[model samples]
Target: EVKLVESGGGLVQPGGSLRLSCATSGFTFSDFYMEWVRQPPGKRLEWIAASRNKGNKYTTEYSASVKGRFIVSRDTSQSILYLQMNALRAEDTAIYYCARNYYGSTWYFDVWGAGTTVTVSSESARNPTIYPLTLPPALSSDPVIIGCLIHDYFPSGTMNVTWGKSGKDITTVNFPPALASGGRYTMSNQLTLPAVECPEGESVKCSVQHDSNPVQELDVNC
Candidate 1:
């Protein structure tokens, strides 16, 4: 026979006070700290922040603009973790992940859950176009996210499109996508940051080096 267990659920009114719950057993609640992670629908994953039963809380490693009131609670009696988010928005369509934090004289994300998945509806978010985007406004460097959509008609012999931000070249850290679909291909590159964060005139350069000549060129600022 299989053992059956029950867990608590959280529900916050539309105005605020959103709560979530996770049930676990075969483990002690005191041995682990709870964490909260969120992902925007149809977008890359984000590490929102983490909270500890001993009263330690930390936000994402990125800029402050992306962090907000994310909470983690514990019911030692039930050996469960609770997650809460205030002021929910459509952008909150994310799979909230519950994880254990391990620190042996040092803290780092070692073990994580399979992660939650949430579906978002009708985002209605529009992309904006900025002119003179490639120019760096000042002489400071900041971290920014840059994406490139390439469209090239004619190219031959081991062609590759390289990207740069604010005059600095980008080195891709993620896996290179498979080159298939025969001639018709799409490639994207992201830079951890540009010359500056939220650059006043941030610009991205998409230069294809096929045949060692500039085939297509476009610039954008986010």
Candidate 2:
């Protein structure tokens, strides 16, 4: 009974998309239905969705998709699967995993993988054209924080480190080193604004952009 697990710690902004890989070994992808299940930071399991490797996709409104959210994909050829989620929020941090249906026509999975941990953090980036990022509190007008990785100088949109605040520029010239990845390298970052003078119930966003198809995003409030 092998399972799929993911590397943890991914931060994104609201309205962003995130993709996680469930690469497994010692398993027959064609013989079983693939499933994606997730658990909140300290909550119970939420069955995201499932798909038979043959061509059938069954999606439910439970898990995080009660609002019609989250998706999962299976690759029988490589014995791997993927889960793609969009418009994430700060509370979306959870452990995501892939599984195979061994128990007939019901919604039960047998073979499972060590789930990957994804944490939603607050951070944003504007267009790559802007440099020397500004932190928080020092606000601006009509500022957009994009958490996805985007390079300003690289041709054809390369990945770079960046962060920003509203309207004004925040300095990121001395950013931290990239965390070490044990397997396939997927990058993520987060941002949090210092509590400031606000009306009430202000919302912030986090986002992530990977070098693959289908971008991902998330949203949060203060």
Candidate 3:
């Protein structure tokens, strides 16, 4: 088990200095690696820095954007990690998170913090674009699949996609989001139903509620 705590962010203007901190618990701090990630209000996740400590020997790596203007360090005695950025820009406004690599597995981050938001200025907002797809109309009593694609969504990789049939709730399976080159997220959700329960002209709807785009519903004929 692991937990990460992030410090509150301070208001800073362009060319000003900013600092953030993350305190951790419930794990052997020196055994696994930790990382700092950021996401603008409506963009894909970006890696900022990574750190590791082995028997008091510490090492770190930073992203290109943060290489010269930022510093990543840790205080082993207090189980804390710190990030400091200098000469900030409006594009620097984002929510910062701290995550830890799962022990015994160095390739993935399994533990995360709630994140701390940093506002750089009055930023513009954007909405997520949704697309729906359905298989050929059921001709037999077999399972049929319906899908919803969420494109260019924001803030994070996770989002909620709900399914309904004739206004009744239906279960859906969520797939991992595909990261785009320009810092956006694309996700897919699928719903399966027996043909006996859904016939020609049956309506299946997928709905999502997001910060910028609230309550978007798209339906398909089965």
Candidate 4:
């Protein structure tokens, strides 16, 4: 299996350069080839670059659109693939993926990474706006529901959401974050607990952490 990873909170201004990476594992790195793919917001997948390792030698290829501005390379000893982009633009904002291919059958990917997102924008940094959602009341036999909403975040990057009650950590079901126009994102997380555990006056808190923003917390009284 292969996992495609990318830079967390990679922010670059126009004319600058950014190098994103993917750490490969679960199999022999030299046994297969690796490639990079990218998708701009609301756009189709673009084959940006690819690399192959065989017989102790390595060779790489690049798409015409990215020929001079992007470089794809691999460090077999470290099991990492990289996509280096220069002369950045707002249009370069995209989610990048590193994929694994069968040694000889290039271009066909069997495994992919949880894309890394890069946002190009001139706006100032802003933390996610996190708030609590009042869940429907529950009966004694039901589990109490708690929800948190996060929105209008800038300079997209990696985010982690978690739950806690009375100052102790709790398990949470987090939904994937969705990118919106103007280089922002929205997401939510929820926690479920036995009704008895959330008596009135009990406090529940949601904390959001991200690479581009400060840790944010919001509390709700149950």
Candidate 5:
């Protein structure tokens, strides 16, 4: 019996580094080898890197595509494995798994991680155009949903939108990314204005996080 718990998944920005961790148990950690496997969305599985113990010392091997950029390491005493990925690209997004492997010529997996989702985002991302989708009378504009049209992004999975006022956070009504009239993908997010706390000439902030602003956290608009 064996088990591998994995983490370090979900959203990832391109051209940076990402690390995936796997904690192991129920077996001799050093006696067996471990490796990482990646399966792209709707694509076949590919092995990224592998690590084994040699003379009670660990050694790692990496594939051609990720030879210099990816590093694999292990902790025999702690029974853990780590996969460090560098220079992440849009295509690096996928479900990554860490698995224990049997030795000898005929190799197979023993224990495996449940698999973590690495949602790849658009490197060529775009910003959302904020507009008035629904408006109310200025006399008491307590509630109005402003719509933001986010389009022309590729691999649009990690696009996030937030609504906040006065440096406090607010919830936003968002939709999944869909195909736009153009070849690229788009998502529409809506924001609800502040309730009775409204002050005249006060501003509510709309923030968006997408491929375009990977360096900065998000883009702020009033």
Candidate 6:
């Protein structure tokens, strides 16, 4: 009922163009301005553009990085924001986020979308690597944080990452893959198992399914 849903990002052939969408809700869409920020691989965050619309006055601001190639627009009637980007390149591959701000109180991110991934490269991509990891509680007497890092792959219509404890079911929290160094992608998925279920000295396992790799498991704490 109150959220910002981001959509519209996928593989783009070099030099091609595409648009990113953000559907807004929970507040007056026209009352505050919105921003489009992107992270290029492992690089620092880059400001793409921002737009504001109220009454008949609609204004926008752009980052010099876009140099007019990235356009920001919105339809107040639909409460949606659009970011059209042109001339796709390797450097353009990244995770894009739409941010809604709250006024005066320092104008912080009041709302943010789950993020949209952008890929501008087309080639024979590499399969992903799975790194099983855990962030154990300081005293080692609590729920171990079952975690894994996945890397080196591009998405296929759908990418799957799983965490498990042999036959135990999982309610996992996974992050969207971000374009990383060396033209590959990286992601993290973590879950918690109750002390009783993951008792004594058993390990927690994680798996990754991407590209031609059907299944790869890394069991930590074994």
- The model with the greatest TM-score is 4
TM-score, predicted candidate 4 vs. hidden true structure: 0.74
Candidate 4's C-alpha runs over 4 A off are 1-4, 103-107, 134-145, 156-160, 164-194, 211-216
Question: Residue by residue across 94-191, what tens digits does model 5's lDDT show?
Answer: 88899888868888885778777676554443444544343445534454445566656555545557655433433467788877766467677765
TM-score of each: 0.39, 0.47, 0.53, 0.74, 0.55, 0.62
Error of 6 at 157 (Å): 11
The list of candidate 5 runs beyond 4 A from truth reads 54-56, 122-222
- Poorly placed runs, candidate 3 (over 4 Å): 103-106, 122-222
Error of 3 at 127 (Å): 26
How do these models rank on TM-score, best leading?
4, 6, 5, 3, 2, 1
Q: Write the per-residue lDDT of candidate 1 for residues 1-84, one digit (tens) a residue.
A: 111122222222334545566665555555566566655545775666555554444222322423565555567687666665
Model 4 scores what on Cα lDDT? Answer: 0.75
Clashing pairs in 6: none
Candidate 2 per-residue lDDT over residues 1-222, each given as its tens digit? 475654333556666778787777666666567777778855888877766646444332345353465766655677666667777876677777777767667656667776665655554322323222223544533232223332232111123333324433421232322333321222334343334522225554334333222344443332
User: Of models 2 and 6, which has the larger lDDT?
Assistant: 6
RMSD after CA superposition, every candidate: 17.3, 16.0, 8.5, 4.8, 8.3, 7.3
* lDDT scores of the candidates, listed in order: 0.47, 0.50, 0.73, 0.75, 0.68, 0.75
- Model 3: weakest 10-residue lDDT segment is 119-128
Q: What TM-score would you give candidate 3 relative to the actual structure?
A: 0.53
Structural RMSD, model 3:
8.5
Query: What local lDDT score does residue 86 receive in model 4, on the 0 to 100 scale?
Result: 85
Ordering by lDDT: 6, 4, 3, 5, 2, 1
Backbone clashes in model 5, listed as residue pairs = none
Mind giving the per-residue lDDT tens digits that candidate 6 earns over 33-95?
Answer: 889988876699787898864854668888888867888889879999999999888788888
